[PDB]
Amino acid sequence: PKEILNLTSELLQKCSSPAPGPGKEWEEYVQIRTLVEKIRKKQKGLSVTFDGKREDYFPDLMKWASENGASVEGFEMVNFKEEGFGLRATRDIKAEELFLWVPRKLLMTVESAKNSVLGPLYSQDRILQAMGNIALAFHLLCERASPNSFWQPYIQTLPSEYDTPLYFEEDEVRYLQSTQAIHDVFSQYKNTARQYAYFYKVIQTHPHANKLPLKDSFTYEDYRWAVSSVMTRQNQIPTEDGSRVTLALIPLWDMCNHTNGLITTGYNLEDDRCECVALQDFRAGEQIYIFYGTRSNAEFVIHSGFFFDNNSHDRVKIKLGVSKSDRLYAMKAEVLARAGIPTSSVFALHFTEPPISAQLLAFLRVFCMTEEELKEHLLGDSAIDRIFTLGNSEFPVSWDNEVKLWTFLEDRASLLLKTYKTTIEEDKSVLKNHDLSVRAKMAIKLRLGEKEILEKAVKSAAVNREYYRQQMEE
Template sequence: MGKKSNAKKGSHRGAGPAKLLPQTRGELTVIVDNVFKRCTKVPPAATPSPAQEWAEHLEIYKLIEKIREIEKDIQLPEYSRLEQVAPFMAWLGEKDVTVSGVEVADYGTLGLGLRTCQNLKQGEEVIVVPKEAMITEETARKSYLGPLIERDPILQHMGNVCLALHVLGEYVSSISSWHPYLRLLPACYTTTLYFTPEHYQALKGSPVLYEAVKQFRNIARQYSYFYRILHSSPEAKSWPIKDFFTFDAYRWAVSTVMTRQNRIPMEGGSGQLALIPAWDMANHEQGIYSTAFDEEGRGCLCLAQRDYSAGDQFTIHYSKRPNTEFFLHSGFTDPDNKNDSLPIKLGVSKNDPLNQEKVALLTSLGLPASGAFMLVPGQHPISPGLLAFTRIFCMDKDSLAKWKEDGEKARGLMHEDCDVGTTVEDKTWAFLHTRVSLLTRAYLTTIQEDEVLMEGASGLDALLRSQLLCEKRILKDAATYLASRTTK
């Protein structure tokens, strides 16, 4: 005899979501409470070691996997994306969205995108999306989730979480006016929220590992927090989101918002997050900003960022962000990213006898006493902030006094050709060279091994290898440059 299912299954496709048996629901609630406690417990006074943080992540991950197993029969409806293109285009017309010279096309591993149907000139208007067609924090407050949003501190202060719940609620609603748009969205994403422990372990040595683990922990905490609300609040009994609210569903909604959200102006406020149909179908390409928001009524205006020939993929420039941000929040990397950087965490020890003098000089330059300083791609990989910090870090008392006397002159510490004296200069380049060497050796694989592993990789495997290669190429350029400086 087989194992009993954890859920009662509907007898036909339109029967709604599967229902958990009462005993199973009770077991699930106990595990959810455990997740919430682990994710919200007060950290110890001493900073936990990387090994302790990893062990805690594994415990949370195991609990989430138990939750996913129990919830496996509660599935969101899925739709063929290509079959949804025609209804989506018709819906855009009904919503007065203007789409000129482009059409939805399948770009394989890149997913759906936009393809030009005609030649386009740079600056030509291509997409216009009125605010009424967007899913926003404002529409969330006007939905049945409005009363919860008004009283919940997390939803009031975290627009992205508010939007994620709203998106999920509209997706499962039987009467949502955004169905043609939402049903065109991907069924899953290449964000780090879908990583397994093996994926996380492959990132050892990378500065994004800690951020990716923290992101997973945050989503686990949010899921457990809202699960408790949806299954304890009397008003939630009639909400369609309640029966579909699983970890997988929430992860999907969060990934949808993370990879597509943009901030638009809001009357009387600093702005609000929004999903912008049609415009968000365009994939990223290095270039210039070509999107604006017409506050007088037209909404989001998207222009061609360059000349396009008919049949080209129509792209937009997302923003000047490093690959770490694209990797963590958008689920892709750009190997040709001119704005890429790799953070190095450095700090002046509180036990340093010259701590006060060094901190004072750093403060005068607008630099922190501890934080992340950047390596960048190219022939000059040491960013001005990193160079100035390291020089000050390596100074003795006399050098610090000399530079403190002339605040304007001190800004020269950010330039490579600044004369700081042979001793400080030699220490600076030697320190950076050693640091880059240590960072390079901290990875589990070499750049050559990653290049081999990248061949034939797809999905999450390709994503993490691409990120590792981007990081290691910056380190390689930095090592080459620093080696030349230390041998002069």
């Protein structure tokens, strides 16, 4: 333990530092990554392992869940080559049919964590109180480490590894260099490392940790596993009394895969159970899917561990705001405030049509607006009506403002596109020609998706600029 404590302290001291700024962002990452590996290298890996194949434990999950009133009828567990494990129908299922439910007593939740062996520490530590997902991850490890716990039949069917970024090789991460997504990756890695270092110290010293099953061994690998298991599986349910909402892991639900559609999941408070209905008709033998949510591709890769290709909800981040150096700053600020729009914020450029939201359009209409136009939108009772047509695409302020607006956006989108290291044809060529690892494929596909969205934004802005200018001439 001396080596671990000495390095643990070093890690906490280094990772607690504020970012150095972008010139050293890659550098910060690899330094933490190196130190984390030095620590992980000296540990045995997971404290608790099981000897069978993952699939060999499915019969116990199914038995255990059926004993507690869960739905175990009409579907079974199979290994799909493309996604890995998931549910398959054994009987035909119709859309909106209830096929799955899970009673509250089988769920792993923060509310239940409060009453487990972790309770005494939960109540004292600030992070466990503040971070729902951390308290849930530690509850999961405590149960994993307890051989007679209620959830062993479920914990035993979880995978030993995940494809989220915490499991990426350095050279796989490298493919994301300069993409927007990498900023969120760097943060995720850094925060995970910090949490481990902090808690390792807490378990070793805090007196309420003396009776925990995690007292003898808490490896980096154990923490990484637990955090990943929560973030790739968790959902939100109401608390027992309906007074608040809380994180939960839901056995025999988290085995459903992802596709496009409507949300089919939710919690039935009256009967105290989680429910799910079929998204689409499935014939026996088909893979069962649910909709995970309207998430971006960066979120799916970073938090859920996979890259979904037909992501109709994908987008990129753009930061805009009104300069304080402007002459009309105060007036623009007043119009935006009246409209409920902040002076500066992060907006998004979307994959699907239209490329911009009404809020961004309204923002930009003010951003490019001149003094006279601002007075029209500020002075007079009619001003309020003018302000609430700003997000309405059929109500341009002036042909001049629309041209300035689309010119501005055309240039911003092009400038962002120019910051990438590779171009579109090159990335497509690599994906087609190289026998890449799965993780490398994700990094590249994600990189490509960001460029494709920006290219579309430029083309659309260019067209609108020409359209409005032509109207100006008439």
